[PDB]
């Protein structure tokens, strides 16, 4: 064989170019930096009103608006300062797996097992919430709607491919293929020109939203990646598996910077979020509780433990003022 | 201390709360049934026989059933099945014709063993009965399952297969298996589902009280 020999030596000698220039681990340098102690965060607000499991949640762009999508076919927009429900949207499918908020507060996208990413319009002339555009064209279940502008959004699916759509015409503007499993998550970059996606073949991959280019591939887990988010400066991204491992990969160093597992952990991570300073890498677990990990020393600097079922969604605001968590017991609890 | 507009906002929030509670109640009186089975197992036959994800809503004897079919899953990684907790029962369909039987057996073991489906009864169906014998005559369970040593007739072999699937149940203390054999042509496939969900619910109610 010739191309198999060339591909084998390509992967092994590019890994050798990575290893020969790999100076040291992230902890070997940050070891002398002092820890942050125990971040005992308290439940300030306890949003109630959902009567089924809560599957996803997105903050507003003004650190006050909020969306929560539940299993009983309800999408609720919360005022998170007075615990008031701003809006309640009936959902064509009770099989809601993900939801998103527009960065201008105008639209809200929500989708799931019916392969259709619905996009709703809140700022109407009639005072109700009508469905603006149902993006259809996926062959399987949907995950991680993520708004770029009011006319642009990337949606992951179980068709081993993600898709950049165009809300005006309604077509699949850009198609990102290259996975060998069901892409469970994606997270938009803070500059909104790149994104990363994690799939059920134990491997993430950094994609460019402009050219549809497979820029980088990430590996290191043994099981599927269930959720993903970016370091707030857009140069590193931490994922969370069912391996009970959160991992931090650098987009430029091409390998995992460091692992965020503990031996006492029995079950896998469901959600991953970053504080605004990039110093508290939160992680919701299936053990009914989330762990706020110190993102430089990998020590659990606090445990948010108020839910009665498995944590399903985390969200830190744009200023970092709060941590909304949502679980299968129908309760979002804000922690400050 | 509320401003003139916060008072109307709080009134709207309370009205939204009322609507959410009253629609939840309506959504909690509905029987959720997951539909599983291997390919060409009559999933398609049962959904038509029955009165992305495809939901079939039907009312039977005052019970409103939402039967959710997830066969259309492009790749069954099944990291989405946990979404089907709470479902009253998992209707699993198998066909004697399709050793596709050994495929159905491994699937049945998988569904019963789940940490998510340990309390949920399973309604297993062998609905069709018009082509389940004409093959037995020419070939019993010896060709697919070597271990069988019983009479190569319909009743004996069918009962043995049923028992061998039932044998897959690894904890009979919490869940039960309700098996069906009567021909699909008779319109009793739904009636059997109705009896089983009634039983599942009666037992769930008495088990909470502590009587069970």
């Amino acid at each position: 064989d010739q191309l198999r020999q060339e591909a084998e030596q390509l992967k092994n000698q590019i890994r050798d170019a990575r290893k020969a220039c790999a100076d040291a681990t992230l902890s070997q340098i940050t070891n002398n930096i002092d820890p942050v102690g125990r971040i005992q965060m308290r439940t300030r607000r306890t949003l109630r009103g959902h009567l089924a499991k809560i599957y996803a949640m997105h903050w507003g762009t003004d650190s006050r608006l909020l969306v929560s999508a539940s299993q009983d076919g309800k999408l609720i927009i919360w005022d998170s300062y007075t615990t008031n429900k701003v809006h309640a949207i009936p959902l064509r499918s009770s099989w809601v797996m993900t939801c998103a908020y527009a960065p201008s507060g105008n639209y809200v996208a929500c989708g799931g097992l019916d392969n259709i990413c619905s996009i709703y319009n809140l700022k109407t002339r009639e005072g109700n919430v009508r469905v603006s555009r149902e993006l259809a064209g996926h062959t399987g279940y949907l995950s991680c709607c993520r708004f770029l502008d009011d006319n642009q959004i990337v949606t992951s699916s179980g068709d081993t491919t993600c898709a950049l759509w165009d809300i005006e015409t309604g077509q699949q503007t850009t198609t990102f293929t290259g996975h060998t499993g069901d892409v469970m998550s994606l997270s938009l970059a803070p500059d909104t020109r790149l994104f990363v996606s994690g799939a059920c073949d134990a491997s993430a991959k950094l994609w460019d939203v402009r050219e549809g280019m497979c820029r980088q591939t990430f590996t290191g887990h043994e099981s599927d990646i269930n959720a993903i988010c970016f370091f707030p400066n857009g140069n590193a991204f931490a994922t969370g598996s069912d391996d009970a491992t959160c991992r931090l990969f650098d987009l430029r160093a091409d390998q995992e910077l460091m692992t965020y597992s503990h031996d006492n952990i029995i079950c896998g991570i469901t959600s991953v979020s970053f504080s605004k300073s990039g110093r508290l890498l939160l992680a919701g677990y299936d053990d009914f509780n989330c762990n706020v990990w110190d993102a430089l020393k990998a020590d659990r600097a606090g445990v948010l433990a108020g839910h009665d079922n498995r944590v399903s969604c985390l969200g830190v605001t744009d200023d970092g003022m709060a941590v909304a968590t949502g679980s299968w017991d129908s309760f979002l609890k804000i922690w400050n | 201390t509320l401003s003139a507009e916060d008072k109307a906002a709080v009134e709207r929030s309370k009205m939204i709360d009322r609507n959410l509670r009253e629609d939840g109640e309506k959504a909690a009186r509905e029987v959720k049934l997951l539909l599983l089975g291997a390919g060409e197992s009559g999933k398609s036959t049962i959904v038509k026989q029955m009165k992305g994800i495809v939901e079939t809503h039907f009312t039977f004897k005052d019970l409103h059933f939402k039967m959710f079919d997830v066969g259309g899953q492009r790749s069954e990684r099944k990291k989405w099945i946990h979404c089907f907790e709470g479902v009253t029962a998992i209707i699993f369909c198998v066909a004697l014709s399709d050793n596709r039987m050994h495929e159905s057996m491994k699937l049945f073991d998988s569904i019963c063993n789940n940490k998510w489906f340990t309390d949920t009864s399973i309604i297993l169906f062998l609905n069709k009965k018009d082509l389940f014998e004409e093959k037995i005559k020419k070939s019993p369970l010896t060709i697919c399952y070597p271990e069988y040593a019983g009479s190569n007739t319909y009743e004996e072999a069918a009962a043995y297969i049923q028992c061998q699937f039932e044998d897959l149940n690894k904890r009979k203390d919490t869940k039960e298996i309700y098996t069906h054999f009567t021909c699909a042509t008779d319109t009793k496939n739904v009636q059997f589902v109705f009896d089983a969900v009634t039983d599942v619910i009666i037992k769930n109610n008495l088990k909470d009280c502590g009587l069970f």
Partner: single-chain antibody
Amino acid sequence: VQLVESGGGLVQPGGSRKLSCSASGFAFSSFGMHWVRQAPEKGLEWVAYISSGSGTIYYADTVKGRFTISRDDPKNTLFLQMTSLRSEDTAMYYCVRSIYYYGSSPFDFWGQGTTLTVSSSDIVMTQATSSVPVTPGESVSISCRSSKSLLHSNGNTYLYWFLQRPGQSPQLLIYRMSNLASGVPDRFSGSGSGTAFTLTISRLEAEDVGVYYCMQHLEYPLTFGAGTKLEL
């Protein structure tokens, strides 16, 4: 959207008139409804208010207990039943919709108004003039003053700038001191602080002419300004 009223006409004093506000084109059961009035060539004056679901009902202290408010939500018909009418109740009555949530424009669409003619503490808002002559192409500044500071502890300054073109109904321009309305030309801008409030209109056109108005929402009873009229 089409709000349209009826029940206007001439009445002798001592009688009892009644007005209906038929709505066509929106969700009337999700909107609070104000009744506003305007005396002939004098200015606007708020009358009454009824929050969604008929819960909160407020009146102006001039006719508090002398009028009554009725509402039909599965029929979309809003009623004002006036019990005794003096020679001050004669006015053009308007029926305004108002939705209250975080970020709404709660004085957006005004009804066409109806004429009613009778034969013969509170915040004061003052407007500086009654007539300003100007030509098109000239940027104009209007100003009005309030008694209390309209800046609440929320940060919201509940001041509203309306415009009434001659022969028409009023139209919301600013709903929160410095917030434009739904589809008004971006030529207009509002600014000011606590008590002094100025509306700047750059690139004035021919249609911009009409009686402008400033109104506080901070306190019920809602009190309107005197009314600056742009002249051309």
